[PDB]
């Protein structure tokens, strides 16, 4: 039980773990199915970029505050400063977040210039009349990469 | 190769589908090639076999023997032909079972569904 100069190995297998082994043989199968789900999603909602536009937010805690990342959605103040209704921003592919608040100017400035670039780069198809021949850019995240400040 | 994923290259599933095929599936499994003159006359290569077709046996021990079909025996995947039999020891004449892929059809039994099958496969009906 305790033999030789060996480290104490805390192996947690005294339950009935063999009833609950999940082995991911479907890792290749799910990747094909996820790409097929993305392909049939883009076929459903063509020509929108299959994901909403996410803000450049600052990561919490002192370990990760040196790096910015993607937020859930823009704030109400950010969308209003860009000059569009938050309900209208939801319809044109901008994710908007109602609980995140604005207390940092350069994060606010980076997010509103992201919104200015998004409104300049997309067009809104008219409700009536012939929609223009517009190609679909499949990745809005690859269209707007997040740069460090 | 095998590109469409709906069809299988499993030997077991292919053999199961063959032996447990119903009579409608067995009709097209029991297809026979036409002769050289029937290929020149109708423009098709092979055709599912009927009960009134003049056939010629081109393989086996019955090679070089013509005949007319007596009964398409779809249960044994065989066809039984007239005047090509086996003389049993008690004087009887039992029909020799033949797979239609070893036979060559010399004359057709052209009904209107048979004729409509000819232009369905792309024939000219000469």
């Amino acid at each position: 039980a305790i033999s030789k100069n060996l480290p104490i190995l805390k192996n947690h297998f005294r339950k009935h773990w063999q009833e609950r082994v999940k082995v991911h043989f479907d890792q290749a199968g799910k990747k094909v199915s996820r790409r097929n789900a993305r392909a049939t999603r883009a076929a459903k909602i063509a020509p929108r970029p299959l994901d909403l536009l996410r803000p450049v937010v600052r990561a919490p805690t002192v370990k990760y505050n040196r790096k910015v990342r993607a937020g859930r959605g823009f704030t109400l103040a950010e969308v209003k400063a860009a000059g569009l209704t938050a309900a209208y921003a939801r319809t044109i592919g901008i994710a908007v977040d109602h609980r995140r608040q604005n207390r940092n100017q350069e994060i606010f400035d980076a997010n509103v210039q992201r919104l200015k670039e998004y409104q300049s780069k997309i067009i809104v198809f008219p409700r009536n009349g012939k929609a223009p021949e517009a190609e679909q850019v499949l990745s809005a995240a690859a269209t707007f990469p997040i740069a460090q400040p | 190769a095998k590109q469409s994923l709906d069809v299988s290259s499993d030997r077991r599933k292919a053999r199961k589908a063959y032996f447990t095929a119903p009579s409608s599936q067995r009709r097209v499994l029991l297809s026979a090639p036409l002769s050289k003159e029937l290929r020149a006359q109708y423009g098709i290569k092979a055709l599912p076999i009927r009960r009134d077709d003049e056939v010629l046996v081109v393989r086996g021990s019955k090679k070089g023997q013509e005949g007319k079909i007596s009964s398409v025996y779809r249960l044994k995947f065989a066809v039984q032909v007239d005047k090509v039999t086996k003389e049993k020891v008690n004087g009887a004449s039992v029909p020799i079972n033949l797979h239609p892929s070893k036979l060559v059809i010399t004359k057709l039994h052209l009904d209107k569904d048979r004729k409509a099958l000819i232009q369905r496969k792309g024939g000219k009906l000469e």
């Binding site: 929108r48 970029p49 309900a87 319809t91 592919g93 809104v124 517009a134 190609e135 850019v137 | -």
Partner: protein, 119 residues
């Protein structure tokens, strides 16, 4: 061969029921000839010929019930569509497409827009 349903459907109720009574009579006479003969496969033809007739009798009577109850609420449960119990308890297409006036105002004023990035 026996009787066929396409020319059985050209008849009214009277001669069809008379032929049903008749076809039962050759069925019974074939059953008493079954006891003397060693084989009689003609009883299968009459048995299916009977079965053709009262299928047609049931089909004309049920279609008369459809024409009687046409275009009115509360069709009978045997005379309405038996899809699946869970589908019959489920909401219909109209009631599932119901929304309130508040969500209808939101959908009309702000519909899901069509947009594209020009790269």
């Amino acid at each position: 061969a026996g009787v066929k349903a396409y020319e059985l459907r050209t008849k009214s109720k009277e001669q069809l029921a008379s032929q049903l009574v008749d076809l039962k009579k050759e069925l019974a006479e074939l059953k008493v000839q079954k006891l003397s003969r060693p084989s009689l496969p003609k009883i299968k033809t009459v048995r299916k010929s009977i079965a053709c007739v009262l299928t047609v009798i049931n089909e004309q009577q049920r279609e008369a019930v459809r024409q009687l109850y046409k275009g009115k609420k509360y069709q009978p449960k045997d005379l309405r569509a038996k899809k699946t119990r869970a589908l019959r308890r489920a909401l219909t297409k109209f009631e599932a497409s119901q929304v309130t006036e508040k969500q209808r105002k939101k959908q009309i004023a702000f519909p899901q827009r069509k947009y594209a990035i020009k790269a």
